[PDB]
Design a protein around this motif. Structure first.
Motif, short mmCIF file in Angstrom:
data_model
loop_
_atom_site.label_atom_id
_atom_site.label_comp_id
_atom_site.label_asym_id
_atom_site.label_seq_id
_atom_site.Cartn_x
_atom_site.Cartn_y
_atom_site.Cartn_z
N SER A 173 0.84 -1.24 0.00
CA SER A 173 0.00 0.00 0.00
C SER A 173 0.86 1.27 0.00
N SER A 174 0.62 2.11 -0.99
CA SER A 174 1.48 3.23 -1.32
C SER A 174 0.64 4.21 -2.11
N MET A 175 1.21 5.38 -2.36
CA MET A 175 0.56 6.41 -3.16
C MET A 175 1.51 6.95 -4.22
N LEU A 176 0.96 7.70 -5.15
CA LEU A 176 1.72 8.51 -6.07
C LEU A 176 1.69 9.95 -5.61
N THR A 177 2.79 10.67 -5.80
CA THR A 177 2.81 12.08 -5.45
C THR A 177 3.73 12.79 -6.42
N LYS A 178 3.61 14.11 -6.48
CA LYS A 178 4.15 14.89 -7.60
C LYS A 178 5.52 15.46 -7.26
N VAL A 179 6.44 15.35 -8.21
CA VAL A 179 7.71 16.08 -8.19
C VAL A 179 7.46 17.43 -8.83
N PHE A 180 7.99 18.50 -8.24
CA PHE A 180 7.75 19.83 -8.77
C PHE A 180 8.98 20.69 -8.49
N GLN A 181 9.03 21.84 -9.14
CA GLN A 181 10.15 22.75 -9.00
C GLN A 181 9.77 23.82 -8.01
N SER A 182 10.68 24.11 -7.09
CA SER A 182 10.50 25.17 -6.11
C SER A 182 11.81 25.94 -6.04
N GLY A 183 11.78 27.21 -6.44
CA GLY A 183 13.01 27.96 -6.57
C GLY A 183 13.88 27.37 -7.66
N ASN A 184 15.18 27.34 -7.39
CA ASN A 184 16.15 26.73 -8.29
C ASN A 184 16.31 25.24 -8.02
N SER A 185 15.39 24.63 -7.28
CA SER A 185 15.55 23.26 -6.81
C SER A 185 14.32 22.43 -7.16
N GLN A 186 14.40 21.15 -6.80
CA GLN A 186 13.34 20.18 -6.97
C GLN A 186 12.71 19.90 -5.61
N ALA A 187 11.44 19.50 -5.62
CA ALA A 187 10.75 19.15 -4.39
C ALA A 187 9.67 18.13 -4.68
N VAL A 188 9.26 17.42 -3.62
CA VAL A 188 8.23 16.39 -3.70
C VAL A 188 7.14 16.70 -2.70
N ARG A 189 5.91 16.71 -3.17
CA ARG A 189 4.75 16.85 -2.30
C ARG A 189 4.65 15.66 -1.37
N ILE A 190 4.56 15.94 -0.07
CA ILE A 190 4.34 14.90 0.94
C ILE A 190 2.84 14.86 1.23
N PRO A 191 2.13 13.81 0.86
CA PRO A 191 0.73 13.73 1.25
C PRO A 191 0.63 13.63 2.77
N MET A 192 -0.56 13.97 3.28
CA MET A 192 -0.75 14.03 4.72
C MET A 192 -0.56 12.66 5.37
N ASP A 193 -0.83 11.58 4.63
CA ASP A 193 -0.60 10.25 5.18
C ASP A 193 0.81 10.10 5.67
N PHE A 194 1.74 10.87 5.11
CA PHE A 194 3.15 10.73 5.42
C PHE A 194 3.77 11.98 6.04
N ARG A 195 2.96 12.98 6.45
CA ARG A 195 3.49 14.24 6.95
C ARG A 195 4.58 14.02 7.98
N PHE A 196 5.65 14.79 7.86
CA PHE A 196 6.68 14.82 8.89
C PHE A 196 6.33 15.89 9.91
N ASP A 197 6.78 15.69 11.14
CA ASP A 197 6.53 16.64 12.22
C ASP A 197 7.79 17.41 12.58
N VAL A 198 8.84 17.30 11.77
CA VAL A 198 10.03 18.13 11.88
C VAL A 198 10.21 18.90 10.59
N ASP A 199 11.20 19.78 10.56
CA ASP A 199 11.48 20.59 9.40
C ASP A 199 12.72 20.11 8.66
N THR A 200 13.42 19.11 9.19
CA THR A 200 14.64 18.60 8.58
C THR A 200 14.66 17.08 8.61
N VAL A 201 14.94 16.45 7.46
CA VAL A 201 15.06 14.99 7.38
C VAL A 201 16.43 14.62 6.80
#
Lengths: 74, 134, 135, 70
Positions: free
Chosen positions: A1-29
């Motif tokens: 059991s897994s999901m698909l989520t979107k890769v997107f550009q933010s600033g000069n970098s890349q980022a991945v949307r974290i769905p709420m099922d997987f939300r982190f409770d810190v700001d650094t991983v």
């Protein structure tokens, strides 16, 4: 059991949307790559997160100038 | 106990942000205090002036010092400095002048200095230091 | 007015008793104050440890600083040191580190720094200073 | 008026001050008037106290402090 989520550009970098099922409770991983091309995310503790954030903001030019201590004897 | 981050360990922390040192910080007891010397703060300001984005650097420093407070000394720093400046001159083995001031600041507080440059600071034999990298 | 005697003028005064200085001191107004930076006091302590009679040297230091009080830093010295350390990095360390701390101390107090034979201080263009050995 | 003696002190000359002419200061201004007389004028109280602050330091102290290295 897994999901698909979107890769997107933010600033000069890349980022991945974290769905709420997987939300982190810190700001650094931690992030690393397994042999198979999987990228793995593991949060740090809240205390480590808040301490190491204090050293976000200092760019390479600042580190350049600071490292240039030219600390000669008395 | 006061734990004083020297200038070099703060450079290390900016280049490598390692979990190891974050772990050691958390171990500090409640009445403990994590700080830097006015010497190191002055060196941070220097870096702000020698950096591309001065306003950014200054905001980074302000946030840093809000949690790692800058301390300013009293007469005891000068007593340690005179003593150690003389001792090391006689040895012919002087250390950097800002580092010397930093070390004597730590002595004047009976603080633990946190550094990744143990060889220099070991010459200040009365100094309590720990290397939170090693 | 706050007059901060640097380390060189104090050394000079230990070796000489010159008329020019008597005259300048005579011109001091009643609310004027003579002080020294903690930097200079630390150098004095160092001379005591390097001297034949430690206890006499410390006694002379106590007498001196009773009149020429030692001042200790606050945040403003660090702002000035950061600016001028950066500027002076390009110029080939023309100012010694302890002299620089002393200059920035005077800047932080808007004091007039009193010196002997440190023309380097002219590179710190907002420093107010005077050589009380010259005319 | 009186007479008094010139003598040598170390490598320098000195004059003895008889009791009736004693000074209360450690430092006097010395100058030569128009008629050639030498004059000793005590410095003020303020000046004497300032300069006294620097008299106690010996040559080993100065030699160590003169090494600023900087």
């Amino acid at each position: 059991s897994s999901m698909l989520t979107k890769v997107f550009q933010s600033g000069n970098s890349q980022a991945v949307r974290i769905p709420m099922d997987f939300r982190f409770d810190v700001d650094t991983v931690e992030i690393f790559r397994k042999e198979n091309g999987d990228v793995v995310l593991r949060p740090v503790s809240k205390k480590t997160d808040d301490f190491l954030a204090l050293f976000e903001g200092f760019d390479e030019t600042f580190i350049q100038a600071l490292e240039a201590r030219d600390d000669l004897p008395p | 106990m006061i734990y004083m981050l020297d200038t070099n360990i703060i450079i290390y922390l900016m280049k490598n942000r390692p979990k190891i040192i974050a772990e050691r910080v958390s171990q500090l007891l409640p009445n403990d205090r994590l700080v830097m010397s006015f010497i190191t703060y002055a060196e941070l300001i220097k870096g702000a002036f020698g950096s591309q984005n001065y306003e950014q650097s200054i905001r980074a420093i302000e946030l840093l010092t809000e949690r790692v407070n800058v301390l300013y000394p009293n007469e005891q720093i000068c007593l340690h400095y005179g003593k150690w400046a003389n001792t090391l001159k006689k040895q012919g083995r002087p250390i950097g002048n800002n580092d010397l001031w930093i070390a004597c600041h730590a002595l004047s507080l009976n603080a633990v200095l946190i550094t990744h440059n143990v060889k220099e600071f070991q010459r200040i034999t009365d100094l309590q230091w720990q290397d939170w990298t090693k």
